[PDB]
């Protein structure tokens, strides 16, 4: 299991916006977190949230299976990092 | 944890080869596996092995932390799916 932590300072999201190729508006909410990749300290990672989802509260989390998909060359990829409480 | 299975029919690798932009030879070994993504059946996934590593034997495996890296846009990505026995 991957250990992910939302620190107290990372409890909010920011929103970027724009317009798709054929005219539709979009909004993307982004939140920061720390992921332990086994180096001397955890590293900073950006998360893009799913539609209608609030910012994750501060705490410890692991990665849900729905984060992964098979990509166009047949290898596994991350779609969006989706978290669940540890 | 992600459940990965190497079936008896997937016990071998194949090798693709070529030449880099500035002349160096390369060889890549590829193996197939099944990954359970929570659908009605596991899905077929291609693995590219690391240099000097044999094909994984048939059996159950999970994904090692070294499979992941932070990408150039600051989000988590899979580098290569690296497995360890379950």
From Swiss-Prot, chains A, B:
Q: Where is this site: Involved in DNA binding?
A: 16, 21, 26, 34, 46
Pfam families referenced in this protein's UniProt entry, alphabetically: Phage_DNA_bind
Biological process according to GO: DNA replication; rolling circle single-stranded viral DNA replication
- Cite a single GO MF annotation: single-stranded DNA binding
Q: Does the keyword DNA-binding apply?
A: yes
| Keyword set includes DNA-binding | yes
Q: What residues correspond to the site Involved in DNA binding, and in the dimer-dimer interactions of the protein-ssDNA complex? A: 41
User: What InterPro entries would the database entry show?
Assistant: NA-bd_OB-fold, Phage_M13_G5P_DNA-bd
Identify the keywords attached in UniProt to this record, alphabetized: DNA replication, DNA-binding
Q: What does this protein do?
A: Binds to DNA in a highly cooperative manner without pronounced sequence specificity. During synthesis of the single-stranded (progeny) viral DNA, prevents the conversion into the double-stranded replicative form. G5P is displaced by the capsid protein G8P during phage assembly on the inner bacterial membrane.
Subunit-structure text: Homodimer.
Please report the name of this protein according to its UniProt entry: DNA-Binding protein G5P
Question: Top-down, what is the taxonomic lineage of the species of origin?
Answer: Viruses, Monodnaviria, Loebvirae, Hofneiviricota, Faserviricetes
Give me the gene this protein comes from. V
